[PDB]
Each structure stands twice: as C-alpha cells, then as structure tokens.
Amino acid sequence: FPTLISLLEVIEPEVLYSGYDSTLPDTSTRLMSTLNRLGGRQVVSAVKWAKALPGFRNLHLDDQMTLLQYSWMSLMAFSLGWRSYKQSNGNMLCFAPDLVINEERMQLPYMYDQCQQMLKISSEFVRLQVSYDEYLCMKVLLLLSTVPKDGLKSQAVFDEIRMTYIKELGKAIVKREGNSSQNWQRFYQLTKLLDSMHEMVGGLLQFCFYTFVNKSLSVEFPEMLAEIISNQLPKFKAGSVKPLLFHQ
C-alpha cells in the first residue's frame, strides 16, 4: 500500500519543452503567443494529473470541470514559481528548460509588468524555503481553493478531499522538522501563502483576460485555453466566484 505523498510525487507532470525557435528574434507578441501555446499543453498535463489525483474522481463531473476552470492559472503560475525557485533561486522565470526569461528579455514592450507579477510567486518560495513535499500538497490545495458562490453539486465529497490534503500538508511540514510547536508557525506561513495566491493569480488572470479580449495586441491562444478562458470570462466579470481562505 503506497503513501499519499509518494503518489503525489509519481503523478507530478514532467516539465514540458516549448520548442521555441531561438533563431528568430524575440517580439512581445511572439513570446506571449509562445507562452500561451505552452500553457495549453501544460493544462492538458494538469487535467491528466487531476484525473489521477486520489480523491478527485469522486467529485461530480461538473465539479471537476468547475475546479479546473477556476484554478488552472493558479496551478500553472505555482509550478512556474517552483521551477524558477529551483533552477535560478527566483532570479529568472524558467517557463521551460528551452525558454528562460531573464532580466534582459523582460525589457520587451508589455513584458516587464507581467513578468514582475510572476516573479512575486517565485520569491515567496525563496523567502519561505519551501520543500518539494510542501509544494506538492499546496499545489493540490490550489485546485481546491476556488469554488462558485453558491457551492458545488457534491459539496459532501469536496469537503472530505480538501480535508485530506490539508492533513497531508501537515505531514509534509512535520517531515521537514519534527513535532515542535514551530510546526504550527510554519503551517500558518504556508497557509498565508496559499491565501495570498488569490491576489497574485488575480493579477495574472487580469492580464490574461485583457490579452485574450483585446484583438489588436495579436496574442494567440490555443483552442484548449481559448475555450476555457471565454467560458470563464463572464463568470469572473460577474464576481460569482468565492475564494476559500484560511485566514482573516
């Protein structure tokens, strides 16, 4: 019988390559389009990941659709943060091994602001010195951290899943340190981080909606993301979305 943490490790998606062509010069439109094309594939990876996530398949199909639509950007941004922390200690954005945006590349028109946002996530990992197991658990929590304002078709199951993974984050913290009462200080810090993710991601979500809607910027989106964004867009304009916070 395998532990839940070890399953989380085995099912974690492998880092994708972008297949960016470093031959041609960089432009804002091209870069953003490349990132979106990469995001499409990363999201498909995340869906396959969710389907293998212990617990997740028990939710109603419509709750599955809902949680993935509401949280895809969180998942992607969080992973980006992790990779950036791991490969460059938060100095560069490591989108893919073949696509790293450093200080210089950020100077492109439009890029600087959006990149500053994504780096915030990265430096959080740096500040708190997050561990792999902590990261894996927090990531699951993000999937389960945004619900519709009037709840889910199977709130029963949802609440149980959410509780299992909170417990799991617990074990992960303990495994780093032992059974001190600094353990609950850490739990606070990490739950504070999960909370601050709604604001940080909200920023990204805004840029995303903007570049999606405003055709004149000529940013392309793959069908996967386009379908999701266009469905998710009215729901966010109508503020019918509720974050689950750990704190006040």
Partner: peptide, 14 residues
C-alpha cells in the same frame, strides 16, 4: 458555452 476539449478529457466517453 461549455469548454469542449476539457469536457472530452474529463468524461472520456465514446
């Protein structure tokens, strides 16, 4: 309406 590919992936239904 409802996002097609995401739906296809989650139901898996022929």
């Amino acid at each position: 309406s409802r996002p097609a590919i995401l739906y296809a992936l989650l139901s898996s239904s022929l």
